[PDB]
Assembly symmetry: D2
Homo-oligomer: 131 residues x 4
Amino acid sequence: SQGWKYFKGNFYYFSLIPKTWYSAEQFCVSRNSHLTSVTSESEQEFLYKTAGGLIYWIGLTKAGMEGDWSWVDDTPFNKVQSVRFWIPGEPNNAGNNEHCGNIKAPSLQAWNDAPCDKTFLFICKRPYVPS
Amino acid sequence: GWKYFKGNFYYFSLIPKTWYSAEQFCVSRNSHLTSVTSESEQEFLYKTAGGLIYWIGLTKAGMEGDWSWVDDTPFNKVQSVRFWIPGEPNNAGNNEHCGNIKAPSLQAWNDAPCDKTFLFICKRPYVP
Amino acid sequence: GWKYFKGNFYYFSLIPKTWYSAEQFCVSRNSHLTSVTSESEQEFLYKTAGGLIYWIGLTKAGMEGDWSWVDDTPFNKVQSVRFWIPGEPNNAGNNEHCGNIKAPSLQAWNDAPCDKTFLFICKRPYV
Amino acid sequence: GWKYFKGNFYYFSLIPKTWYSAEQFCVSRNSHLTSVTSESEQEFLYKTAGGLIYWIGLTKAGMEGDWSWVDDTPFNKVQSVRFWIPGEPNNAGNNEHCGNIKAPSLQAWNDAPCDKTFLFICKRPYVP
Ligand SMILES: O=S(=O)(O)N[C@@H]1[C@@H](O)[C@H](O)[C@@H](COS(=O)(=O)O)O[C@@H]1O
Ligand SMILES: O=S(=O)(O)N[C@@H]1[C@@H](O)[C@H](O)[C@@H](COS(=O)(=O)O)O[C@@H]1O
Ligand SMILES: O=S(=O)(O)N[C@@H]1[C@@H](O)[C@H](O)[C@@H](COS(=O)(=O)O)O[C@@H]1O
Ligand SMILES: O=S(=O)(O)N[C@@H]1[C@@H](O)[C@H](O)[C@@H](COS(=O)(=O)O)O[C@@H]1O
Ligand SMILES: N[C@@H](Cc1c[nH]c2ccccc12)C(=O)O
Ligand SMILES: N[C@@H](Cc1c[nH]c2ccccc12)C(=O)O
Ligand SMILES: N[C@@H](Cc1c[nH]c2ccccc12)C(=O)O
Ligand SMILES: [Ca+2]
Ligand SMILES: [Ca+2]
Ligand SMILES: [Cl-]
Ligand SMILES: [Cl-]
Ligand SMILES: [Cl-]
Ligand SMILES: [Cl-]
Ligand SMILES: [Cl-]
Ligand SMILES: [Cl-]
Ligand SMILES: [Cl-]
Ligand SMILES: [Cl-]
Ligand SMILES: [Cl-]
Ligand SMILES: [Cl-]
Ligand SMILES: [Cl-]
Ligand SMILES: [Cl-]
Ligand SMILES: [Eu+2]
Ligand SMILES: [Eu+2]
Ligand SMILES: [Eu+2]
Ligand SMILES: [Eu+2]
Ligand SMILES: [Eu+2]
């Protein structure tokens, strides 16, 4: 399938069809991928530049009893290094119901929490495995 | 309230949610949408369900669309094939990637769209 | 060399390995050290084991050191207690963090140091 | 004592263990054998290692035997080749399924038998 863009050892798929957060993750899984994690400034830059003006689900979701933010691809969540990537004022847990995360703003400060059952475009990430 | 059966507690919800919002509720309660690994557990769940539909931990994974359990119990196709409603899973509309308990018998499971709202069942181990 | 039982294939090794080297071998065969989640599976395993000791997928995990299955089957402590040898797990020397099938009985499991070498049993689903 | 670097704490052990016994020690301390995801982290680790060999979270997984991280960080094979000692991994004796930090250089990693005993490095994120 076309639509996979390469960046630093991973391919990224910016969807054309919007889905709920979990239905997006399931699509990514059906393509041997996961909703993308973000672990560096250059990766965040790649994502929001490619996103343009559109909102995309990423692999941010609350997990555990405490509801700490986590990555669906099981990258350990680094709160210290992730603080710089939220939109100012986010996450705000509007309605006490915003348990998933999307990229929203055209900036390094781009993440927003939103209800998992809302439909948005989404970004899958899968590693390249050279022989 | 939680119900106890063979080393696990089970939560039969009173309010419906999407499959994933249900799983997040279970996770917030240190649990998961329930797996099913024996006829006695299947029987306990459908008898307790009382003829109502409840999300369980069934969901597709992998490129193959293989079914899986969200609590990471290995899914056993041979052992589980008799737990589906006859004709299910039929992936109706090409969009039924989660599973629920529906019919009151051992042949109980149906696949349904993950974004549909149903009551749900969490499962939590008792740990002495 | 794989033996079939109720939708799973099982490999009873002829070579002994440490618990983790055994698990690695199982992984290279698209499998894991076996979990045990029913009386009939326990019976099939101890009967086939024939009185020899085999590593199974039992291992301590998490901060509390509770017993777990390496294949990620949730561990049912209540229903598993009848599968340990009487008196086990006894954490001899404070260093027995993996488990094996030892006795030919439904009370079969013993905890032993993960770095000791035993025969091992892999399990993989019929797919 | 845990050493801090870029949002994670690190424990450099004083007693050697096998790879898996090392991982179990880390797990008992709410941690894992360390992953390595940047040049700056690789530099922090080998410089702190001071020329001694430490197990890290490198281990083979899957039927293919691809390298993986035990803390479940997805393994970036493209970006990690810079971190192996030239000529490694060489799977000596076809029995080297775990990895350690060995050479004090950005090219530091060696695969070695999982049953050999080395010092080890645990890693855990700061969680408020
Ligand atoms: O500056 S605010 O306007 O307060 N920012 C809010 C978000 O914080 C909130 O999550 C959404 C809900 O909409 S949703 O479609 O994402 O669910 O609406 C605005 O974007
Ligand atoms: O005999 S069939 O017609 O195939 N049975 C179908 C199901 O297989 C299908 O999942 C649902 C969709 O509705 S939903 O309520 O489950 O979403 O409708 C019927 O019950
Ligand atoms: O009733 S006891 O005799 O004390 N039971 C102990 C076990 O609990 C102990 O794990 C082993 C150590 O040997 S090992 O081979 O398992 O390492 O020896 C005995 O069998
Ligand atoms: O250039 S080589 O000779 O191939 N380098 C080898 C390593 O690749 C090999 O892993 C070890 C085994 O020793 S061990 O202590 O790590 O087990 O010995 C040398 O360092
Ligand atoms: N408002 C709570 C809700 C919550 C707790 N645990 C969770 C686990 C998953 C999803 C949501 C939660 C929070 O942000 O933490
Ligand atoms: N329960 C173990 C200690 C422990 C805690 N977590 C662990 C994880 C793995 C191995 C051992 C542990 C003991 O007392 O001896
Ligand atoms: N020669 C293979 C052996 C192997 C495949 N899968 C594994 C999983 C675990 C340990 C070893 C393997 C390799 O090192 O890649
Ligand atoms: Ca159906
Ligand atoms: Ca013992
Ligand atoms: Cl698409
Ligand atoms: Cl009971
Ligand atoms: Cl409820
Ligand atoms: Cl039964
Ligand atoms: Cl019992
Ligand atoms: Cl019992
Ligand atoms: Cl008992
Ligand atoms: Cl130490
Ligand atoms: Cl590289
Ligand atoms: Cl590189
Ligand atoms: Cl390179
Ligand atoms: Cl190399
Ligand atoms: Eu960087
Ligand atoms: Eu928000
Ligand atoms: Eu219906
Ligand atoms: Eu040497
Ligand atoms: Eu080597």
